[PDB]
Amino acid sequence: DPAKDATPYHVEFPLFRSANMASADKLSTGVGFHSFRIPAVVRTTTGRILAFAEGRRHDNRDFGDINLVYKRTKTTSDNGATLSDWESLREVVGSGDGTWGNPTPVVDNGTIYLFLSWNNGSYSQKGGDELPDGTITKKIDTTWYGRRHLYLTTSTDDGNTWSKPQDLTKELTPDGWSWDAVGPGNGIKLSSGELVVPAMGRNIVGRGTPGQRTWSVQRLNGAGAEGTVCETPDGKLYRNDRPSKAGYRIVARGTLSDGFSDFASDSGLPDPACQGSVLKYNTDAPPRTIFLNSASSDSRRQMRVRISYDADAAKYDYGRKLADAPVSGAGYEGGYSSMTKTADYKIGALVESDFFNDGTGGGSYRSIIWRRFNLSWILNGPN
Numbered sequence: 001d002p003a004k005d006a007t008p009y010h011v012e013f014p015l016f017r018s019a020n021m022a023s024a025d026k027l028s029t030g031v032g033f034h035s036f037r038i039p040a041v042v043r044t045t046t047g048r049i050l051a052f053a054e055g056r057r058h059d060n061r062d063f064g065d066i067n068l069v070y071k072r073t074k075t076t077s078d079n080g081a082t083l084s085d086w087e088s089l090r091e092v093v094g095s096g097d098g099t100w101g102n103p104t105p106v107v108d109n110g111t112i113y114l115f116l117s118w119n120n121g122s123y124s125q126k127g128g129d130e131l132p133d134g135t136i137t138k139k140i141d142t143t144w145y146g147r148r149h150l151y152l153t154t155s156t157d158d159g160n161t162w163s164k165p166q167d168l169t170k171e172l173t174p175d176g177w178s179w180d181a182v183g184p185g186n187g188i189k190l191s192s193g194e195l196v197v198p199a200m201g202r203n204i205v206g207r208g209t210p211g212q213r214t215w216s217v218q219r220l221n222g223a224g225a226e227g228t229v230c231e232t233p234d235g236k237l238y239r240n241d242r243p244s245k246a247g248y249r250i251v252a253r254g255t256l257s258d259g260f261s262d263f264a265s266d267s268g269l270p271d272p273a274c275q276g277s278v279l280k281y282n283t284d285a286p287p288r289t290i291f292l293n294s295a296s297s298d299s300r301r302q303m304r305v306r307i308s309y310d311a312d313a314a315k316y317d318y319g320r321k322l323a324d325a326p327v328s329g330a331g332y333e334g335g336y337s338s339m340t341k342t343a344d345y346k347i348g349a350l351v352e353s354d355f356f357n358d359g360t361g362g363g364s365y366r367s368i369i370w371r372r373f374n375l376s377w378i379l380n381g382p383n
């Protein structure tokens with residue numbers, strides 16, 4: 001791999017700082033957040049980087065009052081290289097005391113499309129959870145009021161402002177569903193121009209052209225709830241999803257016109273039942289797909305970034321442990337992740353981190369780390 005010839009480069013620092021941290025991130029209104037979790041990142045066509053997260057107001061739990069927050073790089077050409085290159089925290093949407101989450105952006109010229117999930121603030125995935133005011137949650141159900149909704153918000157000004165989110169549940173989530181998720185992480189634009197956004201049991205597919213997109217659903221029997229998608233070097237689609245039980249990533253390959261294979265466990269990619277991320281890096285010799293998850297069947301703290309050179313992303317190298325370049329003072333790193341390719345030819349990654357001050361409890365502060373590294377950094381890892 002000729003990219004190994006570059007000097008290894010890596011930088012890493014917290015970008016979304018929980019309430020316990022010195023420079024805890026708050027909106028300009030004064031509204032702060034206990035925890036940030038569920039990252040999504042995209043480089044726009046200007047080179048600006050947009051980083052999204054769930055701002056979890058009161059504790060780290062997946063329900064209750066959660067706002068969709070973000071940061072942009074200050075300019076289109078700084079590549080988020082230092083903390084001072086990032087704007088202050090902003091909000092995409094935070095209306096109501098319900099949950100706005102699952103950021104899943106896709107860039108289309110320019111327009112950034114950001115798909116989100118939402119639930120009512122009286123409901124949770126399991127039900128029976130206690131809220132700050134003493135209310136007990138109802139379990140997410142199939143009713144309009146109590147089901148998981150799918151929203152779309154758009155930016156046509158490089159992420160500066162966002163349209164009021166539009167509820168596309170009736171159009172893009174099957175009737176009768178209760179739980180739902182989009183991404184989280186990112187959607188993609190194919191070499192042939194279609195937009196493909198991974199979601200629970202389905203792709204959301206944007207046909208048409210830039211400036212005139214039309215959305216529909218490609219259902220995928222056996223897909224995960226939290227999916228990732230990319231275009232492999234052979235031109236086909238590749239779903240690499242979180243499994244329902246700890247063990248291994250589940251994978252399927254297909255096309256928009258012919259559909260997908262069934263999903264199968266990939267024994268080369270252990271996973272502890274956690275979200276992952278995938279990135280098409282380049283098309284020229286040699287073609288590369290990047291994959292990032294916790295490379296373990298029982299821990300989220302074994303984050304590993306990897307490269308596949310296969311036309312179908314069948315097999316990956318060992319890659320490199322993110323712990324080889326650890327961050328201090330921002331918790332124990334590991335969990336959900338998102339990757340993009342920066343305009344200065346780095347991998348830019350967001351990774352969850354957990355202070356663990358309340359163990360697995362709701363009071364444990366969660367932060368999100370930003371990382372940049374070149375391919376060389378991965379390739380020069382001790383395997």
Ligand SMILES: O=C(O)[C@]1(F)O[C@@H]([C@H](O)[C@H](O)CO)[C@H](O)[C@@H](O)[C@H]1F
Nearest residue numbers: 027031065067091093094095096097
């Ligand atoms: O509901 C919230 O989280 C909030 F506290 O109020 C939201 C909103 O003004 C109200 O919920 C009504 O839409 C803000 O967008 C949030 O930043 C925050 F201030």
Ligand SMILES: *[C@]1(C(=O)O)O[C@@H]([C@H](O)[C@H](O)CO)[C@H](O)[C@@H](O)[C@H]1F
Nearest residue numbers: 038062125181225226242273274275
């Ligand atoms: C995530 C997690 O940290 O495990 O889990 C998902 C969801 O519960 C699982 O995919 C099972 O359906 C949450 O939606 C997400 O917020 C995060 F908690």
Ligand SMILES: [Ca+2]
Nearest residue numbers: 094095096097
């Ligand atoms: Ca809110």
Ligand SMILES: [Cl-]
Nearest residue numbers: 180181225226
């Ligand atoms: Cl999910």
